[model samples]
Target: SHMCDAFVGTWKLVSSENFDDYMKELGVGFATRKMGGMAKPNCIISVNGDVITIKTESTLKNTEISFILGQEFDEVTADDRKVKSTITLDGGVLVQVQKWDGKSTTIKRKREDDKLVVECVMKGVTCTRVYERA
Candidate 1:
């Protein structure tokens, strides 16, 4: 459907409503989470067939990652947590399979209500971040 392809562009995190809670779930420190909530982050995604490259920039960190669709690989997350992951299309949704230190996790991304929603899950915690197109 190429709906997943539509997400292959630049996205700016203008503001996050529940970033503090999200960070807390990720085990981020209070000081770091608070600062992250106040910072505006920018994300850029590039897709070449089944391979995707992602770049996220913020006042506290700038991270870039690349992975192939349906194939797993290692990833260092935003908070410096190392993860192994892959992304594939399920219908029009982008689904992710992530393994961090032998622990399996999953994430999903989709568009809803004119916003891009990224749902990340690990253990029993789920955090959703929605980004609007610029």
Candidate 2:
């Protein structure tokens, strides 16, 4: 099995590309997009038994979501959209799929060369966020 513990740590954002477009795909307004684009977020991940917790923090807001692998749970996104979210670990990458109001998005997170790389997709728009261990 791939090592899930590889992601158990705090990671600070190093860079983000196409983030505002990704937020736009989610129907986020210009004010929120401006704030989101200006803020650099830190991601903290932890695991206990079968449950995994992902915490995202920034100057604008802090959000945490916890769930067991393969289980679906309710999630309120940073932009305040309620959705159903599922998380699974595949080949050392943590994959998150979210659905709301007939729209869906996917976020893939993995450790690569000591950095945490996050890829977020909605429709055809993609955002890449890179992080370093903190």
Candidate 3:
């Protein structure tokens, strides 16, 4: 799909809103959440056929993840807080299973407007984050 190719590039964070709720859902502390909410996260995505790589960069840290389009593979979360059991794609959505601290977590991603919306499920709570094009 054309949209698939559209995501293959680096993106900078211009602004972020509604991230407090996302952090809250992740069971993050007030101080950590506040810092995260205020952080400007940048993303770089690259797609080649059924394989994709995603890199999230911030002043505090950086994370890189990659997966095959329809195949499940092991992955690690942003802060290496979790180990992902599977990473795959459902249509345009990217889905994954994250295992952290002996618990299972699920994550999903889709395009919205000019951004990519990422949803993470953990401990019955859901956290959502968005990334826009550079």
Candidate 4:
């Protein structure tokens, strides 16, 4: 899809809002949450045919995920949760929905002007992280 093209690049995190609470909602431990909150992650995205790959690089830990649009697959999250994940495009936004145990979360990523904005939502908490092209 043409919208996927907008995500093809390296993006460096510039700001994060309410991220610690989001991790808390995910049941991440204290030490992990502290380390995760302190690290700024760079996201690299690429698309090839039906496959889309997203790589996250950070001082704490790096993670890479590859998936096909609209297909549910097993995914191990950055916080180490084993979940079922699916990626889809909603209008111009890239949406990822993950389910683990009985809990679920939605993450929406969109290109706004020259930056990439991400909203991570779990339960009642939402974290917004903004990134600029690197």
Model 2: colliding residue pairs = none
Q: Taking the tens digit of each residue's C-alpha lDDT, what string does model 2 give over 33-79? A: 98899788889989999888899999888999999989999999989
TM-score of each: 0.79, 0.96, 0.71, 0.96
**Whole-model Cα lDDT of every candidate shown, in order:** 0.73, 0.92, 0.69, 0.92
Cα lDDT over the full model 2: 0.92
Model 3, which residues run further than 4 Å from truth? 1-3, 14-35, 70-72
Model with the higher lDDT, candidate 1 or 4: 4
- Candidate scoring better on TM-score of 1 and 3: 1
Q: What is the lDDT of residue 128 in candidate 4?
A: 97
**Model 4 segments more than 4 A misplaced:** none
Q: What lDDT tens digits, residue by residue, belong to model 1 across residues 29-114?
A: 87777667777667787878766887877877888878877787888777667877788878778888767656666667776767
* Alpha carbon deviation, residue 25, candidate 2 (Å): 1.1
Question: What are the RMSDs of all candidates, in order?
Answer: 2.4, 1.0, 3.2, 1.1
Stretches of candidate 2 off by over 4 Å are: none
- Candidate 1 regions exceeding 4 Å error are 14-17
- Using lDDT as the measure, what is the rank order of every candidate, best first? 4, 2, 1, 3
